[PDB]
Amino acid sequence: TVSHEVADCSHLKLTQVPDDLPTNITVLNLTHNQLRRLPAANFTRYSQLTSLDVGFNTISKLEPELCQKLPMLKVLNLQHNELSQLSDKTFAFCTNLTELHLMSNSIQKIKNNPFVKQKNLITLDLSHNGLSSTKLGTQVQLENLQELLLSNNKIQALKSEELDIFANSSLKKLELSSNQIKEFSPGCFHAIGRLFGLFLNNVQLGPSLTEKLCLELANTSIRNLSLSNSQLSTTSNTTFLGLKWTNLTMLDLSYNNLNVVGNDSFAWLPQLEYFFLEYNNIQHLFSHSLHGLFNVRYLNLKRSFTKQSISLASLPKIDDFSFQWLKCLEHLNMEDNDIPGIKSNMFTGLINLKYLSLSNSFTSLRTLTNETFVSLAHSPLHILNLTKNKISKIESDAFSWLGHLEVLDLGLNEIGQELTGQEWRGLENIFEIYLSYNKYLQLTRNSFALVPSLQRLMLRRVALKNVDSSPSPFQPLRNLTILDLSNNNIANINDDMLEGLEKLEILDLQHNNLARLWKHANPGGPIYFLKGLSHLHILNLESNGFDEIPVEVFKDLFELKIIDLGLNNLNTLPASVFNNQVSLKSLNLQKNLITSVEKKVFGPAFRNLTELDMRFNPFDCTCESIAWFVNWINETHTNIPELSSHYLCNTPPHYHGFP
Amino acid sequence: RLMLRRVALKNVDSSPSPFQPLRNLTILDLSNNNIANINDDMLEGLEKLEILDLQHNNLARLWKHANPGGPIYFLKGLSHLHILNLESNGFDEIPVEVFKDLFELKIIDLGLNNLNTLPASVFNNQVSLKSLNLQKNLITSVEKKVFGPAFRNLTELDMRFNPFDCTCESIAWFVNWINETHTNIPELSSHYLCNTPPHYHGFP
């Protein structure tokens, strides 16, 4: 039972509460135990507690004298117990509670009056119980109550007289999930003082019962309403008839298997702002289907449409100008769909759009024609995602209509072409383009000459071709800050590729083949392709097969902090190479062939670090080669994980395996 | 003679050995097949086998002491085996009694592996060895207790790319045997370079 200010007794198999703890503890936790009985006599010492988590235990019943000793107790958790009996005196003396969880206590019925004697309660939980009615008392109480949970109960009817208690209570959440309610009484919710949110997830209503529900929500202050997995197969213009007389803002219709959406079905929600339709089975979307939704700020359509079936090829078709009513839409998530393709008028009318996601939303978008994005002409789009859409070819002027675009995500596709550079025209305010995990790209001289404002360019596992052109393709990228060129098997890299890249900070060249470019036997001399990088911060060169490092390759990296050189064939490093890295933080040399660590090369490197990664190396135990290293190991503040596990001496056999 | 080089053998680890009826088999090639699991009794009854090639495969696990069920001694009963090839198998440990019955072994090939330490008194039974090939391995020490009987009377030696250790406890007997010998050791002063310690770094 470790405790400094928080007392924890989780999964310790306690049978009785401990009697040796500080008096001034505020929270005391005994979750996952078998306290069969919780005597109040053992809590004489414990009188300064605020929260008591005693859930997941085997308490049968409780006594009034438990919270007599606790005048400041505020949270009382009784999850997963056998408290099937409640009385007026169960929670009488203690009234300062603001949290009370009774989940999964197998409570059958509320008899007379368990909850009048407290008025400061905020959250009440009654989930996974055997209650069949929402009656929790006779008179009116729980004035300050805000959170009520009654999910996974056996309630079949929601009567008006059962909620007369909440005539003067402001309720923000009515969790009635997984309960088979099939009858609604008039005035059931009008009896509630201030209803702000209703949650009816996994509750089988149907379209007709949903219409009666909306009629029962007439003339109230509801803000949120979720009908997830409510079996709403179809909707009509009168299904949400009752919601004019309220000002609902959040509506959830996920997992309802909504096959078809009726015309002008959503025209009756003028104040809707957040709408959810994810994981749905929509087959056809009409032009007037989303009418009346001119105030929605966020729409979700992830898996909202019918998946492709080989039996009928029922591709979900979207009519033109279907989203024209969304004048104030600012966030559209429409990932994982089987839309056949982009039409010329599908996104027309979006004048306030700022985020569009199209991750795996099309079956086969092979060609990105210049006429594809004409529907986003007036849309001030900033972030666009085209991942997993099987893009195969990008024509010129494909993104010429997105003048306000800032982030472009084209990764995880099958893009195989040669970059003429005319595909990027019109992206005057672009900042990021993602192109990782494609088939092959062949760079040219003017590949990125039309986007000088580029800052991050990711090309991980894209198999770059013609990367060694005499003029550097990243020359126009004056403001480039992050560049990834990993897993491309790049062989030849010119010296002047990174000239003029003063603002570059992150460079990744891991998993490539540049071993020849650094050997002294390379014709033309070693390539010092890291010159002028005054602001470079993170450098990665893993799995490059390097066998020799030139002495003046890191001469200008004055702000280098993170360097990675693992999984290489390094054996000997030149002396006085790391002098200029006065601000290094992490050095990673795992799985190399180095044998000696000495001051003349690794002295300035080990000035002030925070991490070190040198696991799998055949170190040599000799006073000429390791004595300074093990001395620096003896006293240091750098984090060296598994120092005694894999830093094993391989040679000589006298010290074979000795840490 | 049964040649199966680069044929990608599947279901090779059946409980009854498919080469059991091959009583008169003399040459068997099983190279470049990425064979992973090999049973102990695969070569039982192969008294007349002479040439065995198992190069460019994956049998590293079958010889480690941590392998469940014990190491596989799939070279037992091979009294007439003459040429054995185990290149590029990734071997990291050799069982002590795997070559216990090869009384007529003359050519052995173990290059391009990850061998670092060999058990003492392993090559006692190879009194008629001719060529030993251990190029491109990770061995560091050569001593009498393992390589003494191996260097009795040879004609070839192939140990080019190894990180040898220059210490009187580990190389003194080896360089002494280099000083006087009749075995053919080509490029003896070209690639037999001392890697460790850095004092003798690159010194032949």
UniProtKB/Swiss-Prot annotation, chain A:
Residues on Lumenal side: 1-659
One GO biological process term is: positive regulation of interferon-alpha production
Give the recorded effect for N219R.
Answer: Reduced response to ds-RNA. Reduced expression levels
Q: Where is the LRRNT domain?
A: 1-23
MF terms in GO: double-stranded RNA binding; identical protein binding; pattern recognition receptor activity; signaling receptor activity; transmembrane signaling receptor activity; ubiquitin-like protein ligase binding
Tissue-by-tissue expression: Expressed at high level in placenta and pancreas. Also detected in CD11c+ immature dendritic cells. Only expressed in dendritic cells and not in other leukocytes, including monocyte precursors. TLR3 is the TLR that is expressed most strongly in the brain, especially in astrocytes, glia, and neurons.
* Intracellular or extracellular location(s): Endoplasmic reticulum membrane; Endosome membrane; Early endosome
The UniProt PTM text for this protein says: Heavily N-glycosylated, except on that part of the surface of the ectodomain that is involved in ligand binding.
Q: Which family does it belong to?
A: Belongs to the Toll-like receptor family.
What is the annotated role of this protein in its UniProt record?
Key component of innate and adaptive immunity. TLRs (Toll-like receptors) control host immune response against pathogens through recognition of molecular patterns specific to microorganisms. TLR3 is a nucleotide-sensing TLR which is activated by double-stranded RNA, a sign of viral infection. Acts via the adapter TRIF/TICAM1, leading to NF-kappa-B activation, IRF3 nuclear translocation, cytokine secretion and the inflammatory response.
What protein name applies here? Answer: Toll-like receptor 3
Originating organism: Homo sapiens
**Residues of the whole record sequence present:** 29 to 687 of 904
